[PDB]
Design the sequence.
RNA sequence: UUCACUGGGCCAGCAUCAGUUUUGGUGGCAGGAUAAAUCCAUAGGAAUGUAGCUUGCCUCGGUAAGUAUUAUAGCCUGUGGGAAUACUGCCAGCUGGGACUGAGGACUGCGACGUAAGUCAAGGAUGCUGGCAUAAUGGUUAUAUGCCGCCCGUCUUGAAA
RNA sequence: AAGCUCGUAUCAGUUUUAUGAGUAAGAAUGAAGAGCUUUUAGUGGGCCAUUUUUGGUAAGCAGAACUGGCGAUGCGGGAUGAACCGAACGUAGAGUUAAGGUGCCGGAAUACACGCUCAUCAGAACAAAAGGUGUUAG
RNA sequence: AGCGAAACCACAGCCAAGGGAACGGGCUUGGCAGAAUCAGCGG
RNA sequence: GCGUCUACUGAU
RNA sequence: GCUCCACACAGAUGGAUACGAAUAAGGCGUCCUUGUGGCGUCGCUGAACCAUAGCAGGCUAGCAACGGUGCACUUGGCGGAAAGGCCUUGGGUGCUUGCUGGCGAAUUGCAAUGCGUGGGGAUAAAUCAUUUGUAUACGACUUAGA
C-alpha cells in the first residue's frame, strides 16, 4: 500500500556553513527505502547535489487529520512519456491523500500508461469550497442529494451450478 | 424500481472482518467507493467499495457527512435494527446460523419433530 | 436403514505433475463441500480408501480395498494432496474415492 | 453429487460453458447439454460468421474430403469446440468425451427431468449490457442447418405440453401450503421453529 | 451430550478385566447391572434412549467440516 | 511325567518422544502528531442553506427566491480533555492440527528439576496392541493408464547438418 | 608424478588510502594446500553476444583490440528449436523457490481495484509521415 | 498346370504449421480415417 | 462467379 | 429362437428434486377493474425441498387411526424427437419410528470394505452349382428352376 513520508535535505555542511538550505520536501511511497530513493532522484534533477554528497537526517510519516472526511483533492502532476515532459493537473475525490494518490497512479497507468518511474508528484491540496472543481466528472458528485441506482449487479457463487438462474435486480 | 445509494441508506457487509454487520452510508465518494458508518454494529468508520457491500432494501433519514454520534442518534431514532429483524434477511440469516449450530441430539430431535409434523399434515390432508 | 455411508466421498483428479514431468507419488483428491484450503485443513491426516469390483474371488468378496492418507492442501480450489502405500494405477482419474472420518480430532 | 447433470443451453456462453464442462466431464461426472441451438456467443453476428467460413479455403489440397469436415449441427459444433479443450488423442480423453451428450432442444426423457445452469457461464452475467452477441440460431441456419424450422416448431409443443403440468403442480402445492400454514402454531410445530426448522 | 456417570461404578473394568483363553456369566451380570444403573440416568432426558438406539449416518449434502458436535 | 510362566519373523494402530517442515487460536510488550481515528467541551466560518419568517403560485395553502449559522438537522476550522486501535518489531510467551525421518547401540560429557534420595523431552523409538502356516507378504511375465523418449559408431564440422 | 625446505603474508581476475597524466599499509576481505629444481600424456578452432570499431550507402564487408556462454554442458520454462532466463549434476525421503505459470489440453485463484478497446480475422522485425464528424483524459 | 530367382532391406511411413545450414521420417500443435485387398493419370 | 512413402483416377 | 444330449458363472453405496421468459425486469397470494392494473410478499444463491430412527435394520402386545407406503392386477389418457414413464380407480397383500411396552445383540475380543458353450431332432434361407444380361478387361451385380 502507498504511504506518505517527509524527507529533508542538508547536503553535508562545508566549513562555516552548517545546515545548508534545509531542503525539505514530501514524498509518496510504500516503504522507507523507496521514499528515500525517490527523494534522491528528485534532488538529482531539481538541483545539482549528488546523493554521495547528500545525507538523510530523518524520515517521518504524515497521516491524515480526518481519514473519515470526504475531500476533493487537487493534484498537480509532472510526468514524461514517449514525448517531452509536460505538467498536468487533475482533481480526485477521495477521503485521504494516500488513497487519492493511489487512484491517481492507477488512472495514470490506465489512460496514460505511466508508472511510478515516470510520475512525479508536484503538490496535493484540498479544495475548500464548491464550484472550484474544474473537472465536470468530479463536480458531478457534488450535486444536492445525489441518488443513483446500480443496475445489472454481478454475483459469484462457490458452486459451479445453479437451478434458479437468478436475476441481476439491484 | 431499484435500490439507490444515498445518505442514510443501510447496507450489509458481505466480505471482510465486518462481514454480517450492518452499516449506514454517510456519503458517496464516487461510483465505485462510498463511505459507511456502523457504530451500533461495531464496524469502525471506514470507506468500502460497493463490490464488498450489498445494499439492503431499507432506508432512514441521515444528513450528509453525519459524524459517528449523529449517525448513532439517527440509527437509534429510526429503529432500523428492529426493521432488519422483521425483514427476510434477518430471518434467513438466523435460520442458517441455527441449523449449522445444531448438535447431533438436537438434529435427531429435529428429525423426530419433522416426522410428527409430516404425519399430522398427512392426517389433515385428503380428509 | 436408508443410508449407511459414513465415509466422505471424493474424486481423484490426477497426480501432481508439471508441463512435461509427472510425479505418480503424490495424488490429488477432490472432496465434496470443500471450497477453500481452510476447510481442507480438517480433512488432513484422514485415511483415504478406494473401492472397486475385482474379477478374481480372492476371499469370497470380489471387492478390493486400497488405503491411503491425506497429507496437505493443494491449490486454492480446495484440492488436497493424497498419498497411498500402494500407488493407484492411474486408470482411476475421475473415479470416486472414499475418505474416512477417522482418526478424529474434534 | 448428481449422477447426471443437465445443463440448459439457453443463456449460456459457448466458450465458458465448454471450458467448465470439460473439467467436470474429465472427473467422472456425466453432463448432458440441451437446447444446443440457443447457445450464445459474444461479438457481432457477422463477426462470428466471419470465423466460420475461413477454414474452407484450407480444408485440403490433394483431397478436400481428407481433411477438416464442415459440421453445421448446433449440438455437434459446440461439441467440436469442447473436443479441442480435452486431450481427445489420449485414451482417457476419448472415454471422458463419451460421457458428454448434446441434443437440440430437450428430447425425452430429459423433458420430465430437472435441468441446471452454470452461473459462471451465463451470457447475461458476463456480457456488458447493450453489446452485440450471436445467438447461434441463425448462424447455424446460415451455414446450411435446415432443421431450425423443425426445432422451433416442436419446441412450442413441449412448452405447451409442460405449462399445464406446472399449473397442476402449483394447484397441488396450494393444498400443502395451506395445510402447513394451518398446521403451524402447534407445540410440535413451534419446537421446530426454535431449532431453526 | 453428556450423561451422568458418578452413579455407576467403573473401577472394576480394569485392564485385566479383559482376557482370552460360550459367554462368561460374570461379564453378562456386570453388563446387566451397568445397563440397569444407567437406565435411570437415560430416562431423564426424553428421546435419549431412541437417539442412542438410532445408528448415526450421513445424509446427502452434509458437510462434516461444518457440522457442529 | 504333575505342572506354572513364556515364546521367532511381516507390516501397521495407539500415547509420548528428538530433528525437518506446513498452517491455525491466543496473551504481554516498545514507536509514530506518546499513532492519526472516534467521543466530549470551547471561539469562530460556510452551504450542496437546518428550522423559523417574508415574497408570489397550482395538486390542496404550499412551491421556488430570499433574511437566516442551529433554531422544530447538522458540517468544518483551531484549541483543551481523554482513552482506544491499524502497522511495524520483540517475547530465551502459551496452546493445537497436517506430512516424513527411528538413523546411533551397556555409563564415561554438556544441562534442568529435586532438601537430599533420585528423575528428566539432557551427544538418534520407548512402551501396549492387531492380525498369520490351505499364512501374512514379496517377485516375474503380456496388455492398460499419465508423462517422457527423435537410430547406432565414426568423420570436414565453430555444429546443425 | 617424485624430492626439499616449508606455513604462511606464498599469495588474490577483490577493494581502499599518505602518493600518479599502481609506491608503501604496525590497510579492509578470504584461502593454511606456497616456491624451487627433473620431465609426462593431450593442445596451432571457431561460433553467438558485448566494451572498440573503418564507414553507411537499399546493399558490398574484409581486417581487427576486449570480455561472457557453447566448445566439453546436463535439468526447469519460453507448446516447437544452439545463440534466451534460472540453474551446472552421488542414489534417496521430507518442505520452500527461479525462470515460466494459474479456463481447458496443463499440475496452479474464471483472485481483488482503476479505467482503457469491439478490430469487416483487435489483443495475448517495419511502412509509422498522416487521416477518423472513432473513443478515453489533459 | 509345375518349377523357381535377383536388385534392395538399421526400421520405414495419412497429412498442414514451426523446426535456423530447413532433412522432416520418428520433436510439438491440429486435422485424418478401417484387417485384408485388385489396378495406375502418361508422375 | 462464369467468360477470355502420403493421392486414387475404375475396385473388393 | 422350439427342443434334447453334455459342461461352463472408466467406477452403484438416498432422490437427474420437469412451466415460459426479460436481465433497464421476473414469480406467490389477495382481486376482478380480467388491464401492458392496485395491494402484501419473494431473490440477495441448492447453507434449499423431499427423505432419513428399528440384528444388512428382527419377534411380539396395545392406542390413534382409515392417513403414509414397497408388491401384482385393475377403469384409462397422455408421452412418436432418441415415444419405453406418470398416475390416478379398488380391494388384497407387509410395514408404520405417530405414540406406550417386553424379548436379544457380547467372543467378529482396539480399525484391516464385510448369464454362455459343443453335438443332435423340427424350422428359416443364402452363397455353391446351372442358366440369364439389364451387368461385363477381371471382381461385383441383375433375371429363372422340387
Sequence:
Amino acid at each position: 500500500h502507498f504511504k506518505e513520508y517527509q524527507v529533508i535535505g542538508r547536503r553535508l555542511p562545508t566549513e562555516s556553513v552548517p545546515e545548508p538550505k534545509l531542503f525539505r520536501m514530501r514524498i509518496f511511497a510504500s516503504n522507507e527505502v523507496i521514499a528515500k530513493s525517490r527523494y534522491w532522484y528528485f534532488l538529482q534533477k531539481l538541483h545539482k547535489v549528488k546523493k554521495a554528497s547528500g545525507e538523510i537526517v530523518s524520515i517521518n510519516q504524515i497521516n491524515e487529520a480526518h481519514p473519515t472526511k470526504v475531500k476533493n483533492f487537487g493534484v498537480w502532476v509532472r510526468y514524461d512519456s514517449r514525448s517531452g515532459t509536460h505538467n498536468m493537473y487533475k482533481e480526485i475525490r477521495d477521503v485521504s491523500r494516500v488513497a487519492a494518490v493511489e487512484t491517481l497512479y492507477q488512472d495514470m497507468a490506465a489512460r496514460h500508461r505511466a508508472r511510478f518511474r515516470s510520475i512525479h508528484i508536484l503538490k496535493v491540496a484540498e479544495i475548500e469550497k464548491t464550484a472550484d472543481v474544474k473537472r465536470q466528472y468530479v463536480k458531478q458528485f457534488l450535486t444536492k442529494d445525489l441518488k443513483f441506482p446500480l443496475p445489472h449487479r454481478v454475483q459469484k457463487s462457490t458452486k459451479t451450478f445453479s437451478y434458479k438462474r437468478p436475476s441481476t435486480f439491484y | 424500481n431499484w435500490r439507490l445509494v444515498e445518505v442514510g441508506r443501510v447496507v450489509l457487509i458481505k466480505k471482510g472482518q465486518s462481514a454480517g454487520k450492518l452499516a449506514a452510508i454517510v456519503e458517496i465518494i464516487d461510483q465505485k467507493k462510498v463511505l459507511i458508518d456502523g457504530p451500533k454494529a461495531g464496524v469502525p468508520r471506514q470507506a468500502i467499495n460497493l463490490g464488498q457491500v450489498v445494499l439492503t432494501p431499507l432506508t432512514f433519514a441521515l444528513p450528509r457527512g453525519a459524524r459517528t454520534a449523529t449517525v448513532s442518534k439517527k440509527w437509534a431514532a429510526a429503529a432500523v435494527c428492529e426493521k432488519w429483524a422483521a425483514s427476510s434477511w434477518a430471518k434467513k440469516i438466523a435460520q442458517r446460523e441455527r441449523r449449522a449450530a445444531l448438535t447431533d441430539f438436537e438434529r435427531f430431535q429435529v428429525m423426530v419433530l419433522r416426522k410428527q409434523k409430516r404425519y399430522t399434515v398427512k392426517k389433515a390432508l385428503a380428509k | 436403514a436408508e443410508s449407511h455411508r459414513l465415509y466422505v466421498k471424493g474424486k481423484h483428479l490426477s497426480y501432481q505433475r508439471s508441463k512435461r514431468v509427472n510425479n505418480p507419488n503424490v495424488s490429488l483428491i477432490k472432496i465434496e463441500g470443500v471450497a477453500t484450503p481452510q476447510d481442507a485443513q480438517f480433512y488432513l491426516g484422514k485415511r483415504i480408501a478406494y473401492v472397486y469390483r475385482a474379477s478374481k474371488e480372492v476371499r469370497g468378496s470380489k471387492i478390493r480395498v486400497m488405503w491411503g492418507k491425506v497429507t496437505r492442501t493443494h491449490g486454492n480450489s480446495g484440492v488436497v494432496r493424497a498419498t497411498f502405500r500402494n500407488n493407484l494405477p492411474a486408470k482411476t482419474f475421475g473415479a470416486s474415492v472414499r475418505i474416512f472420518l477417522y482418526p478424529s480430532n474434534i | 453429487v448428481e449422477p447426471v447433470v443437465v445443463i440448459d443451453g439457453k443463456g449460456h456462453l459457448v466458450g465458458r460453458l465448454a471450458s467448465v464442462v470439460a473439467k467436470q466431464l474429465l472427473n467422472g461426472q456425466k453432463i448432458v447439454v440441451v437446447r444446443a441451438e440457443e447457445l450464445n456467443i459474444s461479438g457481432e453476428f457477422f463477426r462470428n460468421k466471419l470465423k466460420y467460413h475461413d477454414f474452407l479455403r484450407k480444408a485440403t489440397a490433394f483431397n478436400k474430403t481428407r481433411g477438416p469436415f464442415h459440421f453445421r449441427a448446433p449440438s455437434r459444433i459446440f461439441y467440436k469446440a469442447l473436443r479441442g479443450m480435452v486431450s481427445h488423442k489420449t485414451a482417457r480423453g476419448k472415454a471422458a468425451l463419451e460421457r458428454l451428450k448434446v441434443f437440440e432442444g430437450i428430447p425425452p426423457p430429459y423433458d420430465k427431468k430437472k435441468r441446471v445452469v452454470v452461473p459462471q457461464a451465463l451470457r447475461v452475467l458476463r456480457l456488458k449490457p447493450g453489446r452485440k452477441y450471436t445467438t447461434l440460431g441463425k448462424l447455424s441456419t446460415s451455414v446450411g442447418w435446415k432443421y431450425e424450422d423443425v426445432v422451433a416448431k416442436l419446441e412450442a409443443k413441449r412448452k405447451v405440453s409442460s405449462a399445464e403440468y406446472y399449473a397442476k403442480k402449483r394447484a397441488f402445492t396450494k393444498k400443502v401450503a395451506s395445510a402447513n400454514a394451518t398446521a403451524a402454531e402447534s407445540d410440535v410445530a413451534k419446537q421446530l421453529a426454535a431449532l431453526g426448522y | 451430550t453428556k450423561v451422568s456417570v458418578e452413579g455407576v461404578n467403573v473401577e472394576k473394568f480394569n485392564v485385566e478385566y479383559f482376557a482370552k483363553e460360550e459367554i462368561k456369566a460374570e461379564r453378562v451380570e456386570d453388563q446387566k447391572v451397568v445397563d440397569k444403573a444407567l437406565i435411570a440416568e437415560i430416562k431423564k432426558t426424553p428421546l435419549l434412549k431412541q437417539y442412542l438406539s438410532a445408528s448415526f449416518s450421513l445424509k446427502n449434502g452434509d458437510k462434516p467440516h461444518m457440522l457442529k458436535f
Strands of chain C lie at 8-17, 22-31, 47-53, 63-74, 79-84, 96-99.
